[PDB]
Amino acid sequence: MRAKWRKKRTRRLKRKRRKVRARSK
């Protein structure tokens, strides 16, 4: 995929594991 949309793909991906981890801080 376009390089920059892959950057965005994972940006989200990190923010979700950011979310999910917080659940058990």
Partner RNA sequence: GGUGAAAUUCUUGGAUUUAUUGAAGACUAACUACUGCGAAAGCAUUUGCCAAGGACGUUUUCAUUAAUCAAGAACGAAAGUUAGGGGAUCGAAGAUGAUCAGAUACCGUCGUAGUCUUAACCAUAAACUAUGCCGACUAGGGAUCGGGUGGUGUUUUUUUAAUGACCCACUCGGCACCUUACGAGAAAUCAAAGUCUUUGGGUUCUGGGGGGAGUAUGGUCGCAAGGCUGAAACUUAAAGGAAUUG
Partner RNA sequence: AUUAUUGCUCUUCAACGAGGAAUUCCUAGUAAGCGCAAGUCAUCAGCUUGCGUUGAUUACGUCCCUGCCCUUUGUACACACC
Q: Least distance (Å) from RNA to the CB of residue 6?
A: 6
Q: Least distance (Å) from RNA to the CB of residue 23?
A: 13
- Are 1 and 9 in contact by the 8 Å Cβ rule? The answer is yes
**In angstroms, rounded to a whole number, what is the distance separating the alpha carbons of residues 4 and 25?**
31
- The nearer residue to RNA, 14 or 23, going by C-beta atoms, is 14
Q: Least distance (Å) from RNA to the CB of residue 9?
A: 9
Residues forming the site for RNA (CB under 7 A): 6, 10-15, 17-18, 21
